[PDB]
Amino acid sequence: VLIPSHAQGELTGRGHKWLEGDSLRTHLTRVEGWVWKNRLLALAMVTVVWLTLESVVTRVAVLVVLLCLAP
């Protein structure tokens, strides 16, 4: 049975937590894990943008979802 991570208390920041901003960029380097290791899917997420949506402003949230959501 898992133990959740403690990212929902951020208490202070003047001593030394474990990892600085890199731990905040775990879900910003794993996204590059989605990009570089799934180039098939990385190119498959372009056909959603300019063929199905036609919704220029609201395309950003669509580009975030299905990339950053899944682990």
Residues within the interface to other proteins (CB under 8 A): 1-20, 22-24, 26-27, 29, 33-34, 36-38, 40-41, 44, 48, 51-55, 57-58, 61-62, 66, 69-71
Gap between the Cα atoms of 52 and 55, Å rounded: 9
Contact between 46 and a copy of itself by CB under 8 A: the answer reads no
Helix (H, G, I), strand (E, B) or coil at 12: coil
Candidates 60, 30, 29, 27; CA nearest to 45 is 60
Binding mask 6-45 for a copy of itself (x = CB under 8 A): -xx-----------------xx-xx--x---x--------
Candidates 32, 61, 35, 29; CA nearest to 48 is 61
> Taking CB within 5 to 8 Å according to partner kind, which of other proteins, a copy of itself, none is near residue 56?
none
